[PDB]
Amino acid sequence: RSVARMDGDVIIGALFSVHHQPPAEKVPERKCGEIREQYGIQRVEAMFHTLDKINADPVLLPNITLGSEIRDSCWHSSVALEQSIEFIRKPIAGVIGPGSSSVAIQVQNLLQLFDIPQIAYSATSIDLSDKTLYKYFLRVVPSDTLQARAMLDIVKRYNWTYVSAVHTEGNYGESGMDAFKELAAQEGLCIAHSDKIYSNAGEKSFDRLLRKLRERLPKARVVVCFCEGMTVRGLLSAMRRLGVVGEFSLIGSDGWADRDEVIEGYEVEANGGITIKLQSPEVRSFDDYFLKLRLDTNTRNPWFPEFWQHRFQCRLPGHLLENPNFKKVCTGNESLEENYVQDSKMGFVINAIYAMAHGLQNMHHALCPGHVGLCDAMKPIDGRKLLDFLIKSSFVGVSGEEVWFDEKGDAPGRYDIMNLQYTEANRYDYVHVGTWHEGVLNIDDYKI
Amino acid sequence: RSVARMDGDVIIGALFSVHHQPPAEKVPERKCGEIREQYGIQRVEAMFHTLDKINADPVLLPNITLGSEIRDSCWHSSVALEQSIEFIRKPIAGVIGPGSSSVAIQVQNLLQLFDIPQIAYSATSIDLSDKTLYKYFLRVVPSDTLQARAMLDIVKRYNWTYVSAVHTEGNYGESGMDAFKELAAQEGLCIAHSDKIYSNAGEKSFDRLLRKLRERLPKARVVVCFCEGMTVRGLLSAMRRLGVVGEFSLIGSDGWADRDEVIEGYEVEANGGITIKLQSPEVRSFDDYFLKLRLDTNTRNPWFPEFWQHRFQCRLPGHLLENPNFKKVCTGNESLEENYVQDSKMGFVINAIYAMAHGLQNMHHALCPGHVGLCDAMKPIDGRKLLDFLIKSSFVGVSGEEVWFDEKGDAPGRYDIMNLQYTEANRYDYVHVGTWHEGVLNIDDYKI
């Protein structure tokens, strides 16, 4: 399988989802789904961008260059464990990833056997907060303990006390929802029908979903979906299938947030929905970089040739990788500004990329103090040591954000409430309609 | 980490639980608790013994010899996940183990990456039968869907329409039940109340079960149980705790079994119940072998020194494997005859072993025709092939039973239907009252 490499004195491996998950029947041979941009190409071009800049910064790791081994995760343990095994066949320092929470349980379950620290940026699951099993796991994002705390608080808000709960099957959906289920049970929140599904269900299973969800009404009008991105798409997909809409008010975890890949197209039904989104400041910096990219100037990232063929439904033939599921050629001069939208979670990954570096720094100051570069004490890099020296590191984010980790592993997290609707210009836009910091819920009644 | 090795032509690696798992805090360091003879030593000495009787048999594996690489599993996914890595680095043909499904997936998740065929004898969850996920997993034991499929049949046999389903929270119950559930919607069995109880739950919630179950009467005197025995005792506890006896009828899976350490004290409230006892018959030969064991001469199995002292609470002075606890040194001539009880799963263990040999054997008939030992096509062993050679393999057991595997990877099932009644003596016995033999039930319409 193809890897995006970059040499360096230090090597930090990472796992980004560059293709969608593998189709059902192909999971044994592990042929991954199609290419992505937001969870995929941007996160690879972002892992690079921030690493060229880190290294060129005279302050952090003055005479120590950083390298990485970026591999594809496909949002699935097998492809993940596959690539994770490739790290142990220079030896990696730390791993950034993988995509899903559940996946990480798999990713580190193995890493901790070689004492390799791991920093997540999208795993909001709670199970990870436990370090006895996943000792070497840490993240720059906050736990669902908070996110589940507020989703329930967004409910009390409008006097709703009858609401179903659908959750994406896995370790992400179990942990978050079980909480949303304990919390409610304290507040004496009665819940209607409850059910879960696999993000890659048969279009036939989805319909069953809406059936059971519609077979119980009109009491249960509002829904809690602590659910994966497409998992919601699929529910909408069924919505359209049954040609009915405006029936429920959904409430999606950051699985939705303000993504378009979810409602791109199916806008007709995903309205009035309420979403959660960790308040990651837009990375104004990244965009200046992304756009300027070319088909032939970017060689380090092996996926571009394929990624490009898709962003324009054209094709560059002749070179090995080609997508013949199309007709027109490429102008050769396509511009990325067309409908471009920076990954929502984009911020975190960059920072987490920093966190991994700071550790190296705080350690260097500790084990090879007064030395120009790396030293005998630092070759090789002792894992357990790079750990401690991590939890204990803290700095200003890539864009004005305090970033640090508590003893357990988790970090500081806060999110805003998003709403999707029809603005003035003919367009379904995601609208900011309230925020949530430490139990305190702030929405904008007038903006809704 | 200590291993029990044996040299031969083909090495079949295995994972037995020889030590209890390490407590949570001690886990990141892998300090597995105490040595286990029940699910531990009796098997290691059984993995050794069996392989002996096979190299003793001139009918099967005539000139090819089986050797073993037996590693400790600690009934945990990490000490097992660890030892499994010691496998991928003569190489191992097939893995026997481990004992728990929670563990099976973790391991099998890895093994399937390098094409190692794995045969389990203890894992029951339906999760594994989904052979996309684990193409290389197979077992000589039935799946729960099968064990439940019979409980669904002890019910269809009496035209009981409404029923309740309680299952111990976690793997054994949640896995088996989720099947008792499908089968019932498919055959028209309305479920009245389904609820989960962690074995170690309080009387508070252990009681709430009763209040909820009874609430759903008398249109449902049948409470189903895919529970763990303790979840069952606890239910009885509340029974006598509230004053009720003989209200409803329970059907307990092999979790309860015809065990006697489940009804002590609470006998009166449990009479009338129908349980599922997985027929594991006994292996005289093992016992003839185990007993005649001596500390001085069993060197292949490195744990015996550790094992011996524990079993007899004595010490080998000045020896590595030493004990500070008790001080009565060992005579060297003590019989295990004291309270000895043959592992209740020993059979399965063994039938797995054999299976792993038949495959090699039957494969070498095909890939190595007319050749005496191993012929080049088998040097080295191609696992992806050994798989098709195993799956389509079949023999008689060590009890007379017949073994084989369906396409998926699952085997048959044989079940004894036990009923608890008041004997002709001042005691209550688990009376044998019928059997479920590979798709077929046999009830006694006047023996209940």
Coordinates of all heavy atoms in Angstrom, one line a residue, chain B residues 310-359:
Chain B
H310 N 1.9 -24.2 44.5 CA 0.5 -23.7 44.7 C -0.5 -24.8 45.0 O -1.2 -24.8 46.0 CB 0.0 -22.9 43.5 CG -1.4 -22.4 43.5 ND1 -2.0 -21.9 42.4 CD2 -2.3 -22.3 44.5 CE1 -3.3 -21.6 42.7 NE2 -3.4 -21.8 44.0
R311 N -0.4 -25.8 44.2 CA -1.4 -27.0 44.4 C -1.2 -27.7 45.7 O -2.1 -28.3 46.2 CB -1.1 -28.0 43.2 CG -2.1 -29.1 43.3 CD -2.3 -29.8 41.9 NE -3.1 -31.0 42.0 CZ -4.3 -30.9 42.6 NH1 -4.8 -29.8 43.0 NH2 -5.1 -32.1 42.6
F312 N 0.1 -27.7 46.2 CA 0.3 -28.4 47.5 C 0.8 -27.4 48.6 O 1.0 -27.9 49.8 CB 1.4 -29.5 47.2 CG 0.8 -30.6 46.4 CD1 1.7 -31.5 45.9 CD2 -0.5 -30.8 46.3 CE1 1.2 -32.6 45.2 CE2 -1.0 -31.9 45.6 CZ -0.1 -32.8 45.0
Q313 N 0.9 -26.1 48.3 CA 1.2 -25.1 49.3 C 2.5 -25.4 50.1 O 2.6 -25.5 51.3 CB 0.1 -24.9 50.3 CG -1.2 -24.5 49.5 CD -2.3 -24.2 50.5 OE1 -2.3 -23.3 51.3 NE2 -3.4 -25.0 50.4
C314 N 3.6 -25.7 49.3 CA 4.9 -26.0 49.8 C 6.0 -25.2 49.0 O 5.6 -24.3 48.1 CB 5.2 -27.5 49.6 SG 5.6 -27.9 47.9
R315 N 7.2 -25.4 49.3 CA 8.3 -24.6 48.6 C 9.5 -25.4 48.2 O 9.8 -26.4 48.7 CB 8.8 -23.5 49.6 CG 8.8 -24.0 51.1 CD 9.4 -22.9 52.0 NE 10.9 -22.8 51.8 CZ 11.3 -22.1 50.7 NH1 10.4 -21.5 49.9 NH2 12.6 -21.9 50.5
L316 N 10.0 -25.0 47.0 CA 11.3 -25.3 46.6 C 12.3 -24.2 47.1 O 12.4 -23.1 46.5 CB 11.4 -25.5 45.1 CG 10.2 -26.3 44.6 CD1 10.4 -26.7 43.1 CD2 9.9 -27.6 45.4
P317 N 13.0 -24.5 48.2 CA 14.0 -23.6 48.7 C 15.1 -23.2 47.7 O 15.5 -24.0 46.9 CB 14.6 -24.2 50.0 CG 13.9 -25.5 50.2 CD 13.0 -25.7 49.0
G318 N 15.4 -21.9 47.7 CA 16.6 -21.4 47.0 C 16.4 -21.5 45.5 O 17.2 -21.1 44.7
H319 N 15.2 -22.0 45.1 CA 14.9 -22.1 43.6 C 14.3 -20.8 43.1 O 13.6 -20.1 43.8 CB 13.9 -23.3 43.5 CG 13.6 -23.6 42.1 ND1 12.6 -24.4 41.7 CD2 14.3 -23.2 40.9 CE1 12.7 -24.5 40.3 NE2 13.7 -23.8 39.8
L320 N 14.6 -20.5 41.8 CA 14.1 -19.4 41.1 C 12.6 -19.2 41.4 O 12.1 -18.3 42.2 CB 14.3 -19.6 39.6 CG 14.0 -18.3 38.8 CD1 14.7 -18.4 37.4 CD2 12.6 -18.0 38.6
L321 N 11.7 -20.1 40.8 CA 10.3 -20.1 41.2 C 10.1 -20.4 42.7 O 9.8 -21.6 43.0 CB 9.6 -21.2 40.3 CG 9.5 -20.9 38.8 CD1 8.9 -22.0 38.1 CD2 8.7 -19.7 38.6
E322 N 10.3 -19.5 43.5 CA 10.1 -19.7 45.0 C 9.0 -19.0 45.6 O 8.4 -18.0 45.0 CB 11.4 -19.4 45.8 CG 11.3 -19.9 47.3 CD 12.7 -19.8 48.0 OE1 13.6 -20.5 47.6 OE2 12.7 -19.1 49.0
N323 N 8.5 -19.5 46.7 CA 7.4 -18.9 47.5 C 7.7 -18.6 48.9 O 8.3 -19.3 49.7 CB 6.2 -19.9 47.4 CG 5.2 -19.5 48.4 OD1 5.4 -19.5 49.6 ND2 4.0 -19.3 47.9
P324 N 7.4 -17.3 49.3 CA 7.7 -16.8 50.7 C 6.5 -17.1 51.6 O 6.6 -16.9 52.8 CB 7.9 -15.3 50.5 CG 7.0 -14.9 49.3 CD 6.8 -16.2 48.5
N325 N 5.4 -17.4 51.0 CA 4.1 -17.4 51.7 C 4.0 -18.5 52.8 O 3.8 -18.2 54.0 CB 3.0 -17.6 50.7 CG 2.3 -16.3 50.4 OD1 1.9 -15.6 51.3 ND2 2.1 -16.1 49.1
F326 N 4.0 -19.7 52.4 CA 4.0 -20.9 53.3 C 5.4 -21.5 53.4 O 6.2 -21.3 52.5 CB 3.0 -21.9 52.9 CG 2.8 -21.8 51.4 CD1 3.9 -22.0 50.6 CD2 1.6 -21.5 50.8 CE1 3.8 -22.0 49.2 CE2 1.4 -21.4 49.4 CZ 2.5 -21.7 48.6
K327 N 5.7 -22.3 54.4 CA 7.0 -22.7 54.6 C 7.2 -24.3 54.7 O 8.3 -24.8 54.9 CB 7.5 -22.2 56.0 CG 7.3 -20.7 56.1 CD 7.9 -20.1 57.4 CE 7.5 -18.7 57.6 NZ 8.1 -18.2 58.9
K328 N 6.1 -25.0 54.6 CA 6.3 -26.4 54.5 C 6.9 -26.9 53.2 O 6.2 -26.9 52.2 CB 4.9 -27.1 54.8 CG 4.8 -28.5 54.4 CD 3.5 -29.2 54.6 CE 2.5 -28.7 53.5 NZ 1.2 -29.4 53.6
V329 N 8.1 -27.3 53.3 CA 8.8 -27.8 52.0 C 8.2 -29.1 51.5 O 7.5 -29.8 52.2 CB 10.3 -27.9 52.2 CG1 10.9 -28.2 50.9 CG2 10.9 -26.6 52.8
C330 N 8.5 -29.3 50.2 CA 7.8 -30.4 49.5 C 8.5 -31.8 49.6 O 9.7 -31.9 49.6 CB 7.7 -30.0 48.0 SG 7.6 -28.2 47.8
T331 N 7.7 -32.8 49.8 CA 8.3 -34.2 49.9 C 8.7 -34.7 48.5 O 9.6 -35.5 48.4 CB 7.2 -35.1 50.5 OG1 6.1 -35.2 49.6 CG2 6.6 -34.5 51.8
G332 N 8.0 -34.2 47.5 CA 8.3 -34.7 46.2 C 7.5 -35.9 45.7 O 7.5 -36.2 44.6
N333 N 6.8 -36.4 46.7 CA 5.9 -37.6 46.5 C 4.5 -37.4 47.0 O 4.2 -38.0 48.0 CB 6.5 -38.9 47.1 CG 7.9 -39.2 46.5 OD1 8.0 -39.7 45.4 ND2 9.0 -39.1 47.4
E334 N 3.7 -36.5 46.4 CA 2.3 -36.3 46.7 C 1.4 -36.5 45.5 O 1.7 -36.2 44.4 CB 2.2 -34.8 47.2 CG 3.1 -34.5 48.4 CD 4.3 -33.7 47.9 OE1 5.1 -34.3 47.2 OE2 4.4 -32.5 48.2
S335 N 0.3 -37.1 45.8 CA -0.7 -37.3 44.7 C -1.6 -36.2 44.5 O -2.1 -35.6 45.4 CB -1.4 -38.6 45.0 OG -1.6 -39.3 43.7
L336 N -1.8 -35.9 43.2 CA -2.8 -34.9 42.9 C -4.2 -35.4 43.1 O -5.2 -34.8 42.9 CB -2.6 -34.4 41.4 CG -1.1 -34.2 41.1 CD1 -0.4 -35.5 40.8 CD2 -0.9 -33.3 39.9
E337 N -4.3 -36.8 43.4 CA -5.5 -37.4 43.7 C -6.4 -36.6 44.6 O -7.6 -36.7 44.6 CB -5.3 -38.8 44.3 CG -4.4 -39.7 43.4 CD -5.3 -40.9 43.0 OE1 -6.5 -40.9 43.2 OE2 -4.7 -41.8 42.4
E338 N -5.7 -35.7 45.4 CA -6.5 -34.9 46.3 C -7.4 -33.8 45.7 O -6.9 -32.9 45.1 CB -5.5 -34.2 47.3 CG -4.4 -33.3 46.7 CD -3.8 -32.4 47.7 OE1 -4.5 -31.7 48.4 OE2 -2.6 -32.5 47.8
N339 N -8.7 -34.1 45.7 CA -9.7 -33.2 45.2 C -9.6 -33.0 43.7 O -10.1 -32.0 43.1 CB -9.7 -31.9 45.9 CG -9.7 -32.1 47.4 OD1 -10.6 -32.8 48.0 ND2 -8.7 -31.5 48.1
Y340 N -8.8 -33.8 43.0 CA -8.6 -33.6 41.5 C -10.0 -33.7 40.8 O -10.8 -34.5 41.0 CB -7.7 -34.6 41.0 CG -7.6 -34.7 39.5 CD1 -7.4 -33.5 38.7 CD2 -7.8 -35.9 38.8 CE1 -7.4 -33.6 37.3 CE2 -7.9 -35.9 37.4 CZ -7.7 -34.8 36.7 OH -7.7 -34.8 35.3
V341 N -10.1 -32.7 39.8 CA -11.3 -32.7 39.0 C -10.9 -32.2 37.6 O -10.4 -31.1 37.4 CB -12.3 -31.7 39.5 CG1 -13.5 -31.5 38.5 CG2 -12.8 -32.3 40.8
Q342 N -11.0 -33.2 36.6 CA -10.7 -32.9 35.2 C -11.4 -31.7 34.6 O -12.6 -31.5 34.8 CB -11.0 -34.2 34.4 CG -10.5 -34.2 32.9 CD -11.4 -34.9 32.0 OE1 -12.4 -34.5 31.5 NE2 -10.9 -36.2 31.7
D343 N -10.6 -30.8 33.9 CA -11.2 -29.6 33.3 C -12.5 -30.0 32.6 O -12.5 -31.0 31.9 CB -10.2 -29.0 32.3 CG -10.6 -27.7 31.8 OD1 -11.7 -27.2 32.1 OD2 -9.7 -27.1 31.1
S344 N -13.5 -29.2 32.7 CA -14.8 -29.4 32.1 C -14.9 -29.1 30.6 O -15.9 -29.3 30.0 CB -15.9 -28.7 32.9 OG -15.5 -27.3 33.0
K345 N -13.7 -28.6 30.1 CA -13.7 -28.3 28.7 C -12.6 -29.1 27.9 O -12.4 -29.0 26.7 CB -13.5 -26.8 28.5 CG -14.6 -25.9 29.0 CD -15.6 -25.5 27.8 CE -14.9 -24.5 26.9 NZ -15.8 -24.3 25.7
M346 N -11.9 -29.9 28.7 CA -10.7 -30.7 28.2 C -11.0 -31.2 26.8 O -10.2 -31.2 25.9 CB -10.5 -31.8 29.2 CG -9.3 -32.7 28.7 SD -7.7 -32.1 29.3 CE -8.2 -31.6 30.9
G347 N -12.2 -31.8 26.7 CA -12.5 -32.4 25.4 C -12.2 -31.4 24.2 O -11.3 -31.6 23.4
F348 N -13.1 -30.3 24.2 CA -12.9 -29.3 23.1 C -11.4 -29.0 22.9 O -10.9 -29.1 21.8 CB -13.6 -28.1 23.6 CG -15.1 -28.2 23.3 CD1 -16.0 -27.7 24.2 CD2 -15.5 -28.6 22.0 CE1 -17.3 -27.7 23.9 CE2 -16.9 -28.6 21.8 CZ -17.8 -28.2 22.7
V349 N -10.6 -28.7 24.0 CA -9.2 -28.4 23.8 C -8.7 -29.4 22.8 O -8.2 -29.1 21.7 CB -8.5 -28.6 25.1 CG1 -7.0 -28.7 24.9 CG2 -8.8 -27.5 26.1
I350 N -8.7 -30.7 23.2 CA -8.1 -31.8 22.4 C -8.7 -31.9 21.0 O -7.9 -32.0 20.0 CB -8.4 -33.1 23.2 CG1 -7.9 -32.9 24.6 CG2 -7.6 -34.2 22.6 CD1 -8.3 -34.1 25.6
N351 N -10.0 -31.9 20.9 CA -10.6 -32.0 19.5 C -10.1 -30.9 18.6 O -10.1 -31.0 17.4 CB -12.1 -32.0 19.6 CG -12.6 -33.4 19.7 OD1 -12.3 -34.1 20.6 ND2 -13.5 -33.7 18.8
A352 N -9.8 -29.8 19.2 CA -9.2 -28.7 18.4 C -7.8 -29.1 17.9 O -7.5 -29.1 16.7 CB -9.0 -27.5 19.3
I353 N -7.0 -29.6 18.9 CA -5.6 -30.1 18.5 C -5.7 -31.0 17.4 O -5.0 -30.9 16.4 CB -5.1 -30.8 19.8 CG1 -4.5 -29.9 20.8 CG2 -4.1 -31.8 19.3 CD1 -3.9 -30.6 22.0
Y354 N -6.5 -32.1 17.5 CA -6.6 -33.1 16.5 C -6.9 -32.4 15.1 O -6.2 -32.5 14.1 CB -7.7 -34.0 16.8 CG -7.2 -35.2 17.6 CD1 -6.8 -35.0 19.0 CD2 -7.1 -36.4 17.1 CE1 -6.4 -36.0 19.7 CE2 -6.6 -37.5 17.9 CZ -6.3 -37.3 19.2 OH -5.9 -38.4 20.0
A355 N -8.0 -31.6 15.1 CA -8.4 -30.9 13.9 C -7.2 -30.2 13.2 O -7.0 -30.3 12.0 CB -9.4 -29.8 14.3
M356 N -6.3 -29.6 14.0 CA -5.2 -28.9 13.5 C -4.2 -29.8 12.9 O -3.2 -29.4 12.2 CB -4.5 -28.1 14.6 CG -3.3 -27.3 14.2 SD -3.7 -26.2 12.8 CE -4.8 -25.1 13.8
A357 N -4.3 -31.1 13.2 CA -3.4 -32.1 12.6 C -4.0 -32.7 11.3 O -3.3 -32.9 10.3 CB -3.2 -33.2 13.7
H358 N -5.3 -33.0 11.4 CA -6.0 -33.5 10.2 C -5.8 -32.7 9.0 O -5.5 -33.1 7.9 CB -7.5 -33.7 10.5 CG -7.8 -35.0 11.2 ND1 -8.1 -36.2 10.6 CD2 -7.9 -35.3 12.5 CE1 -8.3 -37.1 11.4 NE2 -8.2 -36.6 12.6
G359 N -5.9 -31.4 9.2 CA -5.7 -30.4 8.1 C -4.4 -30.6 7.5 O -4.3 -30.9 6.3

